[PDB]
Design a protein around this ligand. Structure first.
Ligand code: 1SQ
Length: 167
């Protein structure tokens, strides 16, 4: 049993809700919240900008030190950093950004990072300002992630379309 409430069950392991990931993270304090990161961990906008704002910029400060030591992530890659006030850990995952011309086949590689964590609160990778089709992102998620994932979808309209169209 876990703390997640109000989710619709899509599969054995994937759950979805129309919810604010920050507001959801603040309520649940999950072991892992996933960030929709870029390779530079520059948390300007979208999910990343919202998560970072909720940490009062502490996520960005930590991320800048990570990059100064390790250099950029790979598209499809990830790193584990602090969850600050939102979670124990933040798994920063880089999905391909279609608005930069990145290979959408890298979306499966991105989701494979989730399999290193038994339970996660996450957004749909490569959705929103990353430019991919969220219906496609949900399909790749279901077909790739084997651990228990609780997806937060900010937009109610999109939430209802994802559920109605789910095979
Ligand atoms: N805040 C938040 N929560 C879940 C999904 C999102 C997608 C895009 C921007 C913000 C989001």
């Amino acid at each position: 049993v876990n703390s997640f409430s109000g989710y619709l069950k899509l599969t054995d392991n994937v759950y979805i809700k129309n919810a604010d990931i920050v507001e959801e993270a603040k309520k649940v304090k999950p072991t892992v919240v996933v960030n929709a990161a870029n390779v530079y961990l520059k948390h300007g906008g979208g999910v990343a900008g919202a998560l970072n704002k909720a940490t009062n910029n502490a996520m960005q400060v930590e991320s800048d030190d990570y990059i100064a030591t390790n250099g950029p992530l790979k598209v499809g890659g990830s790193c584990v950093l602090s969850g600050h006030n939102l979670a124990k850990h933040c798994l920063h995952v880089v999905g391909p950004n279609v608005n930069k011309g990145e290979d959408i086949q890298l979306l499966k590689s991105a989701y494979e990072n989730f399999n290193q964590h038994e339970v996660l609160l996450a957004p749909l990778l490569s959705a929103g300002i990353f430019g991919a089709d969220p219906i496609h992102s949900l399909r790749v998620c279901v077909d790739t992630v084997r651990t228990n994932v609780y997806l937060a979808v900010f937009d109610k309209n999109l939430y209802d379309k994802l559920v109605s169209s789910f095979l």
